[PDB]
Symmetry: D3
Subunit: 66 residues, 6 copies
Amino acid sequence: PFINIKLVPENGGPTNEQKQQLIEGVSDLMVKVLNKNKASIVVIIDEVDSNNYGLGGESVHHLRQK
Amino acid sequence: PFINIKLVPENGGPTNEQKQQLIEGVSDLMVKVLNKNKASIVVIIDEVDSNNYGLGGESVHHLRQ
Amino acid sequence: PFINIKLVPENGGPTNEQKQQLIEGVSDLMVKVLNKNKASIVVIIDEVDSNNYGLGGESVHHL
Amino acid sequence: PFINIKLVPENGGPTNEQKQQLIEGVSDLMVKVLNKNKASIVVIIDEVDSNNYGLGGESVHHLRQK
Amino acid sequence: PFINIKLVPENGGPTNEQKQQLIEGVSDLMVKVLNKNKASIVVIIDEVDSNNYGLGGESVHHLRQ
Amino acid sequence: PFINIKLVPENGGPTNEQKQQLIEGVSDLMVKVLNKNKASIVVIIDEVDSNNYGLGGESVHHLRQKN
């Protein structure tokens, strides 16, 4: 399986350790819910600049300014 | 955040219930690991034919048989 | 440029005409905001089953 | 709805303001065509290096020289 | 590495055999260029409806009479 | 068509030359197998940090510790 996680950096996060927590976490979910083969699980975390992420028609940067 | 899960169906699954468990599990994981706002977490699960998914150069179809 | 639009179908939407509207709408947006090469714009619309799309931890089907 | 836009930066663009126009425009198009929940609209803009984007078998870094 | 190929079906293609060819093709390409590990190469082929694919602001279905 | 390639950089690579080889390689592959139109082929190569890519539940940074 392939899992793509796209998020916006926040408070110096996520750290390398946190990305690892996500990688292992997401992979374990697939195994627990679908009994998938963890060995073949690929995960990619994309960090999007607050200015390149939009929700509701506004950027995350513009939203955090509130 | 946005999470895209791509997987190959098998054994009549994943059922709609298993899909619900994946959405919940990924969303809770984000909230738990990075204190994300579950309300904004979007998840999309794509199901790929076994003849369309390759690993190591072989199709999942040939790998399962 | 490349634009990927993922949505969950509903009420018989989107029809093939509405998909074309999205393709034209997005393509004209890039040329108007960035003056990008209209002829190099690639758009792909993906229709996601209500049970496969989640928002707030719940599937669109549930919502 | 989710919209991913991948482009190659050019002449200083897109600026944070132009990115907002893309996020706004995209979100308005989804509402005008299918009346989707505007608040649930997620938009991600990825800027690709001109040496990492190909078209017609050639990189954008080269095509811009023609 | 992960490779995603999105295309529009036509005249019955791509066949399961042609999909296999794309998987082996892309996979071998990675090994030859960056000597990447074959076993870790994941390939996903998405087949996009001609009414769902647009180029130059025209759907592939309309761009084919 | 559209081809997205996601890989993790390593040992001074991939260079622009190698990225160009990937663009041409994938493009030729599409032309050879499905006679797809070259001009319409879009390829985007993404370079993922070794800490952002996982396989088997371990980041690539970790996997690369072992030869």
